[PDB]
Write a protein that holds these residues in place. Structure first.
Motif, short mmCIF file in Angstrom:
data_model
loop_
_atom_site.label_atom_id
_atom_site.label_comp_id
_atom_site.label_asym_id
_atom_site.label_seq_id
_atom_site.Cartn_x
_atom_site.Cartn_y
_atom_site.Cartn_z
N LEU B 4 -11.90 -8.37 -1.87
CA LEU B 4 -10.87 -8.80 -2.82
C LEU B 4 -10.38 -7.66 -3.76
CD1 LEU B 4 -12.46 -12.21 -3.42
CD2 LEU B 4 -9.98 -12.02 -3.68
N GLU B 5 -11.07 -6.53 -3.72
CA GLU B 5 -10.71 -5.37 -4.52
C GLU B 5 -9.73 -4.55 -3.69
OE1 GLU B 5 -12.37 -4.36 -7.71
OE2 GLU B 5 -14.55 -4.47 -7.28
N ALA B 6 -8.51 -4.40 -4.20
CA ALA B 6 -7.45 -3.66 -3.51
C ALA B 6 -7.84 -2.23 -3.17
CB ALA B 6 -6.18 -3.67 -4.33
N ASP B 7 -7.06 -1.62 -2.29
CA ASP B 7 -7.30 -0.23 -1.88
C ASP B 7 -6.33 0.79 -2.44
OD1 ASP B 7 -9.75 0.20 -0.84
OD2 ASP B 7 -9.05 0.45 1.25
N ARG B 8 -6.86 1.49 -3.44
CA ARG B 8 -6.14 2.51 -4.21
C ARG B 8 -6.79 3.90 -4.27
NH1 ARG B 8 -4.51 -1.51 -8.46
NH2 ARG B 8 -6.09 -1.00 -10.06
N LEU B 9 -8.10 3.99 -4.42
CA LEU B 9 -8.75 5.30 -4.56
C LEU B 9 -9.60 5.68 -3.37
CD1 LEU B 9 -11.56 6.87 -5.92
CD2 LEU B 9 -9.30 7.64 -6.68
N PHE B 10 -9.04 6.53 -2.52
CA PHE B 10 -9.73 6.96 -1.32
C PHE B 10 -10.50 8.26 -1.53
CE2 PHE B 10 -5.73 4.84 -0.71
CZ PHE B 10 -6.16 3.66 -0.11
N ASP B 11 -11.51 8.48 -0.70
CA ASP B 11 -12.31 9.69 -0.75
C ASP B 11 -11.79 10.73 0.25
OD1 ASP B 11 -13.98 8.54 -2.64
OD2 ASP B 11 -15.73 8.52 -1.30
N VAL B 12 -11.96 12.01 -0.06
CA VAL B 12 -11.52 13.06 0.85
C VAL B 12 -12.78 13.82 1.27
CG1 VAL B 12 -10.08 15.05 1.21
CG2 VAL B 12 -9.26 13.24 -0.24
N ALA B 23 -8.23 10.74 -3.38
CA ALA B 23 -6.81 10.52 -3.19
C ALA B 23 -6.50 9.10 -3.64
CB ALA B 23 -6.41 10.73 -1.78
N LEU B 24 -5.25 8.84 -3.98
CA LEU B 24 -4.94 7.51 -4.45
C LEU B 24 -3.60 6.98 -4.02
CD1 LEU B 24 -3.07 7.95 -7.49
CD2 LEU B 24 -5.34 8.69 -8.02
N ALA B 25 -3.58 5.70 -3.76
CA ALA B 25 -2.35 5.08 -3.37
C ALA B 25 -1.68 4.82 -4.70
CB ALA B 25 -2.62 3.78 -2.66
N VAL B 65 4.13 0.11 4.80
CA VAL B 65 4.71 -1.11 4.26
C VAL B 65 3.69 -2.13 3.72
CG1 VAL B 65 4.81 -2.30 6.48
CG2 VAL B 65 6.56 -2.76 4.70
N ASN B 66 2.57 -2.29 4.43
CA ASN B 66 1.53 -3.22 4.01
C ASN B 66 0.72 -2.81 2.77
OD1 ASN B 66 0.77 -1.70 6.65
ND2 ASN B 66 -1.27 -2.23 5.85
N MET B 67 0.16 -1.60 2.77
CA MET B 67 -0.66 -1.12 1.65
C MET B 67 0.13 -0.90 0.37
SD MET B 67 -3.37 1.27 3.48
CE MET B 67 -4.22 1.09 1.89
N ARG B 68 1.44 -0.79 0.55
CA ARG B 68 2.37 -0.57 -0.52
C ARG B 68 2.10 -1.54 -1.67
NH1 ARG B 68 7.88 2.10 -0.07
NH2 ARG B 68 6.59 3.11 1.56
N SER B 69 1.67 -2.75 -1.31
CA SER B 69 1.38 -3.83 -2.25
C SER B 69 0.22 -3.57 -3.22
CB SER B 69 1.12 -5.13 -1.46
OG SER B 69 0.65 -6.21 -2.26
N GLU B 70 -0.83 -2.91 -2.76
CA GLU B 70 -1.99 -2.70 -3.61
C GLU B 70 -2.20 -1.29 -4.24
OE1 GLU B 70 -3.38 -4.06 0.09
OE2 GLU B 70 -5.27 -2.95 -0.24
#
Lengths: 158, 158
Positions: B4-12, B23-25, B65-70
């Protein structure tokens, strides 16, 4: 150095002149904590009569018109994160407002804790040391304006 | 099992498994600091054609288009006071985002500094050891949408 901006924070001096606490001007009123037993360092605000309020540990009086405009603002709504007082940052993590250990002390009560927008959020009254950090005893207000007075177990009043 | 926690902060990650940066969306795109040469750890994103902007030490890619939301939200309105980041409080006092000396580190690049209301205010790049504090190298966007990169003398990239 010309200080062309009006004070909204005042000193509560004892009979020697040592500053033992603070009074502030917020939401149409001058307000300081009842337990600080001293005079407000101002020609006008000291001749006013304050209404005690043991429940909230507060004393207040209405500000003299020309001062009412240049007074703070309070915000009932306040998220977890970090806020700022005189000696830096103040943390908010579910109910408690905490600062580092050995930062706040006697003389700091009546100091506001505010946000980056400059609206007041709480009033310090004292603080409960907890080895690593210090849990502050504040006086907050809700959406309705009901005065709440959060007080951590083992508080030394400041 | 569900997330339920959106995807914004990715690891490199590098070419040996360690995490070297982040990295971050945000606002329609994935973003990471250019100097960190490694692979973003996220199936869709890692296989996207990145675009560099060396003048601003970033390399962005548009969000599917999909991840754009979170993704995160950005704010150009960031007054003087205290902010939030992974290791704690971040002070902003006239141009510099400083943090307590020590808590900085390699791996801390890409991390965002954000306000109490969750909106992002800056992306960290590295730090300049100024004694007690540390003046951060950050990317930020001005009132009109153009990028700006603030970099202190002595900055160590992270």
């Amino acid at each position: 150095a010309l200080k062309l901006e009006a004070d909204r924070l005042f000193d509560v001096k004892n009979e020697d002149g040592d500053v033992i606490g603070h009074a502030l001007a917020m939401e149409g009123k001058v307000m300081k904590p009842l337990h600080v037993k001293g005079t407000i360092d101002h020609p006008v605000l000291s001749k006013l009569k304050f209404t005690k309020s043991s429940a909230y540990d507060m004393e207040f009086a209405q500000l003299p018109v020309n001062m009412r405009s240049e007074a703070f603002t309070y915000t009932s709504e306040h998220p977890e994160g970090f806020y700022n007082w005189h000696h830096g940052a103040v943390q908010y993590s579910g109910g408690r407002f905490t600062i580092p250990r050995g930062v706040g002390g006697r003389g700091d009560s009546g100091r506001p804790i505010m946000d980056n927008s400059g609206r007041v959020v709480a009033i310090v009254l004292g603080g409960a040391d907890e080895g690593t950090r210090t849990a502050l005893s504040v006086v907050t207000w809700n959406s309705k304006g009901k005065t709440i007075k959060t007080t951590p177990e083992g508080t030394e009043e400041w």
